[PDB]
Amino acid sequence: MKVYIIDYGKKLVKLKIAEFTRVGKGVVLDPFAQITLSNKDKDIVRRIGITIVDTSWNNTSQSEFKNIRGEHRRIPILFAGNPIHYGIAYKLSSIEALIATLYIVDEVEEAIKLSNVVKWGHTFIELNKELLEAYKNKTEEDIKKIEREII
């Protein structure tokens, strides 16, 4: 699918997968969003795409997500599989949030090809795989109750 990035993430841009933008497009991954990503954002992702705001979980605020154009969705609980934040909840990198999004929108197939862009992409998947499987192609409410259980 198409991937966009808002910057005030060199990898995805170098690898032809993403481009920069000033205006949000498609589904905007937003930790401050009330609506959780589900199987209803599936066709928006396929036709329009995914917008990423390049930032950290710790020092971000809602001010940099607030007026971004597009459909705002948060990602359910997941654990970073990168060698820097391994095991820590919610602290996903840009490529991990992409892998997660693709998995949940019933596109597990491409969550794999993207996971080979980085050497630890495989680690992130198998660390959360049936968490990802329990998330895949499920409705938001079905996805959200599970998120509450793990906590």
Swiss-Prot record:
Keyword field: Cytoplasm, Ribosome biogenesis, rRNA processing, S-adenosyl-L-methionine, Transferase
Main EC class the enzyme belongs to: transferase
Keyword NAD: no
A GO molecular function held by the record: 18S rRNA aminocarboxypropyltransferase activity
GO CC term (a single one): cytoplasm
Result after altering D54A: Does not affect S-adenosyl-L-methionine-binding
Keyword rRNA processing listed: yes
GO biological process terms on file: enzyme-directed rRNA pseudouridine synthesis
Bilayer-crossing regions: none
Reaction(s) this enzyme catalyzes, per UniProt: an N(1)-methylpseudouridine in rRNA + S-adenosyl-L-methionine = N(1)-methyl-N(3)-[(3S)-3-amino-3-carboxypropyl]pseudouridine in rRNA + S-methyl-5'-thioadenosine + H(+)
E.C. no: 2.5.1.157
Residues bound to S-adenosyl-L-methionine: V53, I75, Y90, S94
Record localization: Cytoplasm
Major localization listed first in the record, in broad terms: cytoplasm
Record family assignment: Belongs to the TDD superfamily. TSR3 family.
Family annotation (HAMAP family): TSR3
Role noted for this protein: Aminocarboxypropyltransferase that catalyzes the aminocarboxypropyl transfer on pseudouridine corresponding to position 914 in M.jannaschii 16S rRNA. It constitutes the last step in biosynthesis of the hypermodified N1-methyl-N3-(3-amino-3-carboxypropyl) pseudouridine (m1acp3-Psi).
Protein name according to UniProt: 16S rRNA aminocarboxypropyltransferase
Species of origin: Saccharolobus solfataricus (strain ATCC 35092 / DSM 1617 / JCM 11322 / P2)
Taxonomic lineage of the native organism: Archaea, Thermoproteota, Thermoprotei, Sulfolobales, Sulfolobaceae
